[PDB]
Design a binder for this molecule. Sequence first.
Ligand SMILES: *[C@@H]1O[C@H](CO)[C@@H](O[C@@H]2O[C@H](CO)[C@@H](O[C@@H]3O[C@H](CO)[C@@H](O)[C@H](O[C@H]4O[C@H](CO)[C@@H](O)[C@H](O)[C@@H]4O)[C@@H]3O)[C@H](O)[C@H]2NC(C)=O)[C@H](O)[C@H]1NC(C)=O
Ligand SMILES: *[C@@H]1O[C@H](CO)[C@@H](O[C@@H]2O[C@H](CO)[C@@H](O)[C@H](O)[C@H]2NC(C)=O)[C@H](O)[C@H]1NC(C)=O
Ligand SMILES: *[C@@H]1O[C@H](CO)[C@@H](O[C@@H]2O[C@H](CO)[C@@H](O)[C@H](O)[C@H]2NC(C)=O)[C@H](O)[C@H]1NC(C)=O
Ligand SMILES: *[C@@H]1O[C@H](CO)[C@@H](O[C@@H]2O[C@H](CO)[C@@H](O)[C@H](O)[C@H]2NC(C)=O)[C@H](O)[C@H]1NC(C)=O
Lengths: 391, 393
Amino acid sequence: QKGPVFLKEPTNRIDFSNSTGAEIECKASGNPMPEIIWIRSDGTAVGDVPGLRQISSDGKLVFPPFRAEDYRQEVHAQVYACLARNQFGSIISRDVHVRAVVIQSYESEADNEYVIRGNSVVMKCEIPSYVADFVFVDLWLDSEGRNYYPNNAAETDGKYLVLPSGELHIREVGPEDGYKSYQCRTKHRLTGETRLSATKGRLVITEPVGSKAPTFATASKISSLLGSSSSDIVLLCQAQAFPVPYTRWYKFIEGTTRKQAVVLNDRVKQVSGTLIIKDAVVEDSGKYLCVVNNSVGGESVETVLTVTAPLSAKIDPPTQTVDFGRPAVFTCQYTGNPIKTVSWMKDGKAIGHSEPVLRIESVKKEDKGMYQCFVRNDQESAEASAELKLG
Amino acid sequence: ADQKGPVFLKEPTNRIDFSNSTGAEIECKASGNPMPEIIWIRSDGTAVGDVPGLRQISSDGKLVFPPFRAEDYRQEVHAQVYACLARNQFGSIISRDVHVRAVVIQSYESEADNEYVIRGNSVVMKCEIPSYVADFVFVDLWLDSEGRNYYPNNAAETDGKYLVLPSGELHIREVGPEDGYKSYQCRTKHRLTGETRLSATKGRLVITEPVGSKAPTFATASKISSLLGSSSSDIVLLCQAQAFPVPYTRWYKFIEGTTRKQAVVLNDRVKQVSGTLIIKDAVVEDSGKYLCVVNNSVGGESVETVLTVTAPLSAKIDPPTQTVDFGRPAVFTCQYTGNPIKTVSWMKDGKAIGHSEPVLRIESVKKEDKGMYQCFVRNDQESAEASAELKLG
Ligand SMILES: *[C@@H]1O[C@H](CO)[C@@H](O[C@@H]2O[C@H](CO)[C@@H](O[C@@H]3O[C@H](CO)[C@@H](O)[C@H](O[C@H]4O[C@H](CO)[C@@H](O)[C@H](O)[C@@H]4O)[C@@H]3O)[C@H](O)[C@H]2NC(C)=O)[C@H](O)[C@H]1NC(C)=O
Ligand SMILES: *[C@@H]1O[C@H](CO)[C@@H](O[C@@H]2O[C@H](CO)[C@@H](O)[C@H](O)[C@H]2NC(C)=O)[C@H](O)[C@H]1NC(C)=O
Ligand SMILES: *[C@@H]1O[C@H](CO)[C@@H](O[C@@H]2O[C@H](CO)[C@@H](O)[C@H](O)[C@H]2NC(C)=O)[C@H](O)[C@H]1NC(C)=O
Ligand SMILES: *[C@@H]1O[C@H](CO)[C@@H](O[C@@H]2O[C@H](CO)[C@@H](O)[C@H](O)[C@H]2NC(C)=O)[C@H](O)[C@H]1NC(C)=O
């Protein structure tokens, strides 16, 4: 009577510690009631692995907590999927990427910053790369016991500002800021446990002798970063000079040398030399230029920004009934950036068609069933289902 | 007879850097008949006199900056761009731009970082130098807890466990657990004061045994970077990425069409060490966009690097001297080298003639035209000049 439709579809990424474990739930409607079958991305069904992987009584895929020595890649590092099958047909859920992580101790270091008097600075929380995925800055702390907290930047005024990217920004540092030592608290997403940095960083304020031209922390005149739509993005410009330089941001026109001055508003803001883009959208993508001038001279560093958007898929029509021999057409309406590939499936099998529109010119008894459109990134996947009825 | 305009025998270098304690002396010498007078000037053409205890003109033509206390630093003296003026009755010539930079010595400490590495792949160890001494301080040698000294190599032979790169960082092939049993210290040497200093912090290699497999991961999320290099110098393009199983890496160089790319040809000159590309004895033609591609069974990643190779500026005028009979044609051809070239300009007895073309032609030689001529090639960071004389018959 009716094909399967996912009511609750597992997320693309499931990350958990070996201590917590995880349980993945998948549910779908239909008439008759579809059966839920957990599978790998390649389509094979998954069974119980003692102490490691279990199919629950309610149809949930479970990974109970386990010893680090019991780690298996075939289970814990595997990409899974949910299969909802019916007499009418079957559908496959978007890729479920399971990563079980054995929790391993780490140390964060707060770096010192050597500053020319009057220039603004940004303090970094150094996080070892192996925990870099699961660890972020909780807050900043100083020797006198003052707390600086992360905020979506509604108000950029004030001396100390914690950037959305986790660094601690400080306006116009004088000698009076040199008596403080700064420390950063890190938070682990999986364990929820907090840890202070092993090393306290502190500002070294050097009084300017003579004049100095703009000088960046690095000699690299170009870089890039990735960002999410609807998330607050930070473009850093790190330069020190005396007399204190002024910074302006420009945006190049696509495939052109020409560029426009970035317009600053209640969403796009500039804190000293740093640029913050709140509530980012895909169109913010492009090539940006930071220009730093002072009386003695000037420099320019470049940045390439790419703003990602979540993948979504919709098939028009959701349902259609065609007669034997007549054409049947499916149009996949998808969104999100970037898009690497489009692909189609029928009742859980690759149809070998990469175009957003799928058309069966002469329909047979075989073609009846559920159809799916799959859009994917390296990072992501999305799925939409549609049903085809005969007569 | 034997009468000739000025020509520089010794032209002071483009960059003069010295510590407040050491001091400096800049000497400019030029020939001529009669003996030319040497006069020190600024870039604007104004003459400079003696500033007591700070700047002094020696009558033999030396510009002297005796040692001074940090309190005595003057922007108008120590940070100034100078030039040498050699004048005679026939004309005058101005030397290349001389950038004088005096530096008050600041105490510093370099950090030898501990680096986390997955077993089996290569690692490069950073020596952090405070950005304010970054100009004047470089890595002299590496030293380890066992007392083994590693010295910077020209990269003649890149085989072997340990290779100190031209840039000063320490590269290590196929790190095993045993390579983490020891701790490393880098020794930095200050260029101006000649003093050597230990890192005072010993970095240690942490070898983490792989739990499952992981795709290529770079130290930073940046997919692009650029760097500058000088001709004849050994240039290092770093690719620092970890994966398990240990990944294989490929270097490419984009075509000027920018769509196409070619595999980098490895030879006795251009050679890569386990993912780190070294270009020895660099030339201008090595410039371009490079791509480091790290692919593995689990996945792949590619980082881009834009390299620019600079060559020193030099200028020479084809005739050094010529004598015209008032026959109307007269010609000077400026031979210049180096990269990049921002501007070419001709000067007459120390003043711009408003001609930027490499070949200066004076049609209609007249008594107004007698004097010294100069070709001037400039980039932002350097300058060069050539001298020539014009005589009448
Ligand atoms: C998930 O994996 C992690 C490892 O990746 C695992 O955490 C580790 O558990 C072991 C226990 O099996 C811990 O060992 C302890 O270490 C502390 C020091 O940190 C010791 O003080 C403890 O004392 C023990 O020693 C006695 C004998 O010497 C025992 O008889 C006594 O009962 C105590 O157990 C003990 O040695 C280890 O520290 C942690 N490591 C980390 C980083 O947390 C975790 O248990 C795994 N989770 C599950 C659910 O299996
Ligand atoms: C600020 O400094 C910049 C240099 O970073 C100056 O602009 C550059 O000038 C050079 C020529 O020397 C050009 O090749 C660049 O294309 C210019 N870049 C830009 C972004 O303009 C600029 O003139 C300086 N501005 C002031 C007011 O001094
Ligand atoms: C050059 O400047 C440095 C300061 O940067 C001077 O070194 C100082 O010397 C005094 C003694 O006269 C010491 O008490 C300080 O600790 C030193 N400071 C540093 C940073 O070394 C040095 O004397 C100056 N040189 C001359 C010739 O005066
Ligand atoms: C090596 O890695 C690259 C990605 O770093 C793989 O994919 C290439 O990705 C680009 C997109 O940036 C596509 O345009 C190319 O077509 C992809 N390459 C191919 C061959 O399709 C690449 O596939 C990897 N190569 C191998 C042999 O694994």
